[PDB]
């Protein structure tokens, strides 16, 4: 019925050793390159991509929807240019959620002028739990997350009315 959009991992203080300013033409807005407002694309800094480790404790007393993604480059040159490694992994866990992702490098038909892909994943973090993000490359970090409050009688309709 409602939710609060809150910043889970503040952009300016959560990643001092990564570049958090990445944009794409495919997400342009008003003529300039941009990116998702709730996600942050982390790339290396000063030639390095230091191992990441971040966590959030759900002190909102609501289920929290956490969104993130994994970048899958078109080639090796791009994988190394951005993450400085050929063997990146992304690992996301909570008390009950556990998933490890591995980037896949492949030539793909272009969609919206891109050959690579970003897969999107999500989970609902229960009140009092902790979500932990560990990675050495290819992570599109959550920036904003939603504290949800459920109601009754609602649904989704498709309409031009």
């Amino acid at each position: 019925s409602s939710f609060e959009r809150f910043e889970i991992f503040p952009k300016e203080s959560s990643w001092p050793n990564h570049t958090v300013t990445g944009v794409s033409a495919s997400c342009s807005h008003n003529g300039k390159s941009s990116f998702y407002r709730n996600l942050l694309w982390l790339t290396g800094k000063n030639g390095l991509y230091p191992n990441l480790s971040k966590s959030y404790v759900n002190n909102k007393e609501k289920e929290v929807l956490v969104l993130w993604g994994v970048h899958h480059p078109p080639n090796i040159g791009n994988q190394r240019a951005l993450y400085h490694t050929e063997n990146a992994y992304v690992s996301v866990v909570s008390s009950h959620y556990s998933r490890r992702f591995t980037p896949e490098i492949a030539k793909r038909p272009k969609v919206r002028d891109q050959e690579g892909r970003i897969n999107y994943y999500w989970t609902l973090l229960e009140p009092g739990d902790t979500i932990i993000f560990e990675a050495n490359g290819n992570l599109i970090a959550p920036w904003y997350a939603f504290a949800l409050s459920r109601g009754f009688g609602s649904g989704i309709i498709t309409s031009n009315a």
């Epitope: 300013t21 990445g22 944009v23 033409a25 300039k32 078109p74 791009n78």
Partner: antibody, heavy 130, light 112 residues
Framework: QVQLVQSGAQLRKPGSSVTVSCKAS????????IHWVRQAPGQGLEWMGR????????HYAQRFRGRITVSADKSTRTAYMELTSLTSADTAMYYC???????????????????????WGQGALVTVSS | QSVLTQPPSVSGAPGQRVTVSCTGS?????????VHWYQQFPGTAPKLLIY???NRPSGVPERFSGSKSGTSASLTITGLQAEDEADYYC????????????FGTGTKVTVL
């Protein structure tokens, strides 16, 4: 090093336009951006705009939008900038510069919106007077 | 454009340590962009001195080192030499007005 090569000094009258070229020599015209920076005599540096020749995309400073056009033609490995409706206040050294913080790939477009001018042209002086 | 504030002049004796400041805002640096520095001598194009706030280009002396904190940045020149007299500029990226690159106002560094 990589050398950007600019046109020489030129004189233009108020109301006319000026075209300043920048050829890529030893560069391997490739997926990198070329930026235009202006410096009036006695002043500091001002960014005017940029082009990425492999995508054909440009971006301009708000002060020049409507007056500045940037284009490139890879067959001669050359970038061009044109500034229209010139006045005496536009007398300046016009420099081209190559970034090193971008390194674009010939697939899709991604930027970190960070960079630096790794290589500079010598500067083309443009004088505007009657 | 000329939005990163720099002192108009910095000075000291040869052999001394001096610094050139660069103050930005939220759109520049405060939006986590880095600071780049250029060294310009009269008659020529500026050349890159520092990039990424702290790194040097090959060929740049150890005398030059920079840093960034908060929304401010600086260039430190330690052990001023006569050849260091120059116009120094800071550069970053400003996210306002649809996005633009910015320069500071410039600093003249004088060896006494």
């Amino acid at each position: 090093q990589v050398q950007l090569v600019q046109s020489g000094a030129q004189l233009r009258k108020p109301g006319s336009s000026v075209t300043v070229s920048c050829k890529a020599s030893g560069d391997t015209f490739n997926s990198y951006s070329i930026h235009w920076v202006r410096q009036a005599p006695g002043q500091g540096l001002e960014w005017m705009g940029r082009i990425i020749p492999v995508f054909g995309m440009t971006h301009y400073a708000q002060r020049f939008r409507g007056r500045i056009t940037v284009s490139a033609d890879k067959s001669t490995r050359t970038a061009y900038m044109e500034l229209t409706s010139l006045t005496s206040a536009d007398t300046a050294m016009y420099y081209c510069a190559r970034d090193g913080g971008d390194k674009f790939h010939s697939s899709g477009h991604f930027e970190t919106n960070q960079g630096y001018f790794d290589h500079w042209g010598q500067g083309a002086l443009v004088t505007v007077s009657s | 454009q000329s939005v990163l504030t720099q002192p108009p002049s910095v000075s000291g004796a040869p052999g001394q340590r001096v610094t050139v400041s660069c103050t930005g805002s939220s759109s520049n640096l405060g939006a986590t962009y880095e600071v780049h520095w250029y060294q310009q001598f009269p008659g020529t194009a500026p050349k890159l001195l520092i990039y990424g706030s702290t790194n040097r280009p090959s060929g740049v002396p150890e005398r030059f080192s920079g840093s960034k904190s908060g929304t401010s940045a600086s260039l430190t020149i330690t052990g001023l030499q006569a050849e260091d007299e120059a116009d120094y500029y800071c550069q970053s990226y400003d996210t306002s007005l649809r996005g633009f690159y910015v320069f500071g106002t410039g600093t003249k560094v004088t060896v006494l």
